[PDB]
Amino acid sequence: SMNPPPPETSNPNKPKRQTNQLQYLLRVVLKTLWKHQFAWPFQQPVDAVKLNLPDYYKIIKTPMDMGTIKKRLENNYYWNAQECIQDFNTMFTNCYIYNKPGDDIVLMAEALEKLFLQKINELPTEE
């Protein structure tokens, strides 16, 4: 019926650092995923009102999208690269949870997930 507030993208109390891994996650991984033809359902939080999906935020309790991930990286929100990778993982599993095997949106998520996994397999060593 009503959308929750979007996930936090900035907290001035959180300690910050810039690493080559987080740089890679923003400059390569997110950049590549963003421009993929199937990215568009994932570029912003699910607006369950506009989409008229009253059960979405009843089923999905940890929302995540790429707009939020991107603002996180841009804000130096992430200390660990694994925080960011987990957020991409939550976004994908959210899609598979709410929707059903064989739905168009699930086929789109799957293709995005394989691209993501390929790019994280080439994640540089901390340096």
Ligand SMILES: CC(=O)N1c2ccc(-c3ccc(CN4CCCCC4)cc3)cc2[C@H](Nc2ccccc2)C[C@@H]1C
């Ligand atoms: C990410 C996800 O699981 N979903 C999602 C999340 C977001 C969106 C979505 C995102 C952006 C728009 C575009 N804007 C809509 C509001 C007005 C301005 C344009 C529309 C739907 C769709 C969808 C999915 N539907 C869909 C429809 C056609 C093709 C592919 C998927 C269901 C599902 C709840």
